[PDB]
Short mmCIF file of C-alpha atoms (C1' of nucleotides) in Angstrom, two decimals:
data_model
loop_
_atom_site.label_atom_id
_atom_site.label_comp_id
_atom_site.label_asym_id
_atom_site.label_seq_id
_atom_site.Cartn_x
_atom_site.Cartn_y
_atom_site.Cartn_z
CA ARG A 328 33.07 3.26 -21.79
CA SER A 329 33.67 -0.05 -20.09
CA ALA A 330 36.34 -2.41 -21.34
CA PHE A 331 33.51 -4.90 -21.79
CA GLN A 332 31.54 -2.59 -24.06
CA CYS A 333 34.57 -1.81 -26.20
CA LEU A 334 35.41 -5.49 -26.60
CA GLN A 335 31.76 -6.23 -27.32
CA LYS A 336 31.52 -3.66 -30.10
CA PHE A 337 34.84 -4.79 -31.53
CA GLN A 338 33.68 -8.40 -31.72
CA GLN A 339 30.22 -7.57 -33.06
CA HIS A 340 32.09 -5.67 -35.78
CA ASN A 341 35.06 -8.01 -36.11
CA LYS A 342 35.64 -10.10 -39.22
CA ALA A 343 38.30 -12.59 -38.08
CA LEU A 344 35.86 -13.90 -35.47
CA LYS A 345 34.68 -16.74 -37.72
CA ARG A 346 36.74 -18.41 -40.40
CA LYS A 347 34.43 -17.75 -43.38
CA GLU A 348 36.17 -20.36 -45.60
CA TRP A 349 36.15 -24.14 -45.50
CA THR A 350 39.16 -26.46 -45.65
CA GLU A 351 39.32 -30.17 -46.40
CA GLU A 352 40.61 -30.97 -42.92
CA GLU A 353 37.73 -28.96 -41.48
CA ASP A 354 35.30 -30.86 -43.73
CA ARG A 355 36.65 -34.18 -42.47
CA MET A 356 36.26 -32.91 -38.91
CA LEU A 357 32.69 -31.79 -39.56
CA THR A 358 31.77 -35.12 -41.15
CA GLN A 359 33.30 -37.16 -38.34
CA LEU A 360 31.47 -34.98 -35.82
CA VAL A 361 28.08 -35.16 -37.52
CA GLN A 362 28.29 -38.93 -37.86
CA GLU A 363 29.03 -39.09 -34.14
CA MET A 364 26.28 -36.79 -32.85
CA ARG A 365 23.44 -37.57 -35.23
CA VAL A 366 20.59 -39.57 -33.77
CA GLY A 367 18.84 -39.90 -37.12
CA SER A 368 17.63 -36.92 -39.10
CA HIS A 369 18.41 -34.86 -35.98
CA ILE A 370 21.77 -33.13 -36.38
CA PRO A 371 22.32 -30.78 -33.43
CA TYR A 372 24.56 -28.16 -34.95
CA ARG A 373 24.84 -26.14 -31.76
CA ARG A 374 26.37 -29.16 -30.06
CA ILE A 375 28.55 -29.83 -33.12
CA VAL A 376 29.98 -26.30 -33.24
CA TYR A 377 31.61 -26.53 -29.86
CA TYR A 378 34.18 -28.84 -31.43
CA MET A 379 34.60 -26.85 -34.64
CA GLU A 380 37.07 -24.02 -34.12
CA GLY A 381 35.80 -20.61 -35.13
"C1'" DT B 1 -39.09 88.67 36.51
"C1'" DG B 2 -36.35 85.80 35.20
"C1'" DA B 3 -32.38 82.62 37.50
"C1'" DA B 4 -30.77 78.70 39.36
"C1'" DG B 5 -32.31 74.86 40.36
"C1'" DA B 6 -37.16 71.52 41.12
"C1'" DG B 7 -39.90 68.19 39.35
"C1'" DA B 8 -41.31 64.93 35.67
"C1'" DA B 9 -41.75 61.56 32.04
"C1'" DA B 10 -39.20 59.29 28.49
"C1'" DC B 11 -34.83 56.17 26.96
"C1'" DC B 12 -30.63 52.93 27.84
"C1'" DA B 13 -26.99 50.02 29.21
"C1'" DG B 14 -25.43 46.91 32.79
"C1'" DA B 15 -24.92 44.07 37.04
"C1'" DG B 16 -26.56 40.66 39.39
"C1'" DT B 17 -29.60 36.80 38.12
"C1'" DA B 18 -30.68 32.73 35.72
"C1'" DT B 19 -29.76 28.99 33.43
"C1'" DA B 20 -26.94 25.77 30.77
"C1'" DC B 21 -24.07 22.75 29.72
"C1'" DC B 22 -19.70 20.39 30.78
"C1'" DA B 23 -16.50 18.20 32.83
"C1'" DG B 24 -14.79 15.80 37.30
"C1'" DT B 25 -14.09 11.83 39.55
"C1'" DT B 26 -15.20 6.12 43.45
"C1'" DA B 27 -16.54 2.02 43.03
"C1'" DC B 28 -17.23 -2.21 40.95
"C1'" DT B 29 -16.82 -5.12 37.96
"C1'" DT B 30 -14.25 -8.21 34.13
"C1'" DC B 31 -10.12 -10.26 32.48
"C1'" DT B 32 -5.90 -11.63 32.19
"C1'" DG B 33 -2.16 -17.02 32.88
"C1'" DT B 34 -1.85 -22.06 33.50
"C1'" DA B 35 -3.52 -26.38 33.54
"C1'" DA B 36 -6.17 -30.21 31.18
"C1'" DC B 37 -9.01 -33.30 28.12
"C1'" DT B 38 -12.47 -32.82 24.75
"C1'" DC B 39 -14.33 -31.40 19.28
"C1'" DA B 40 -15.38 -28.46 15.84
"C1'" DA B 41 -14.66 -24.04 13.64
"C1'" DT B 42 -11.48 -20.87 11.80
"C1'" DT B 43 -7.16 -18.97 10.61
"C1'" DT B 44 -2.50 -19.07 9.13
"C1'" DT B 45 1.15 -20.53 6.56
"C1'" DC B 46 3.46 -22.95 3.50
"C1'" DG B 47 5.40 -25.89 -0.23
"C1'" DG B 48 4.18 -26.44 -4.58
"C1'" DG B 49 1.62 -25.94 -8.57
"C1'" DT B 50 -0.79 -23.20 -12.35
"C1'" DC B 51 -1.78 -20.51 -15.99
"C1'" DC B 52 -0.27 -16.87 -19.04
"C1'" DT B 53 2.15 -13.63 -21.57
"C1'" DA B 54 6.53 -12.86 -23.49
"C1'" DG B 55 10.92 -13.82 -25.17
"C1'" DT B 56 14.48 -17.58 -26.79
"C1'" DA B 57 17.09 -21.03 -28.97
"C1'" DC B 58 17.78 -23.54 -33.12
"C1'" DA B 59 17.42 -26.01 -37.08
"C1'" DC B 60 15.83 -25.02 -41.49
"C1'" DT B 61 14.12 -22.07 -45.43
"C1'" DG B 62 14.28 -18.82 -48.73
"C1'" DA B 63 16.08 -15.74 -51.31
"C1'" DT B 64 20.20 -12.70 -52.55
"C1'" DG B 65 24.06 -10.86 -54.24
"C1'" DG B 66 28.54 -10.63 -55.84
#
DNA sequence: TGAAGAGAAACCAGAGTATACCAGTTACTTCTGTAACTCAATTTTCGGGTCCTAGTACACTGATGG
């Protein structure tokens, strides 16, 4: 196998990749981010994520 | 009085003979390039579109299950 394939399978079957549980600090971060990058009813979550960690 | 040849009327292949193609070459032309202006016809080439089928991202929906 390649190192890339092994890492790829590990990630695609990892469980600590995402955080899977919300914290109040993370909620404040999400709210501050959404209020900054809304343009209306348009909330680009793919642009928002890249400031949310995990 | 037959014998060993003498003569005679048939076939039969073959060697010149007769064709039968089949190349073997001498002049005698055109056709190049360059130049030029002309104009139209035609081609090439060339950057960009154009349409189309097939995925792709992405926010949301709609359950779903523990």
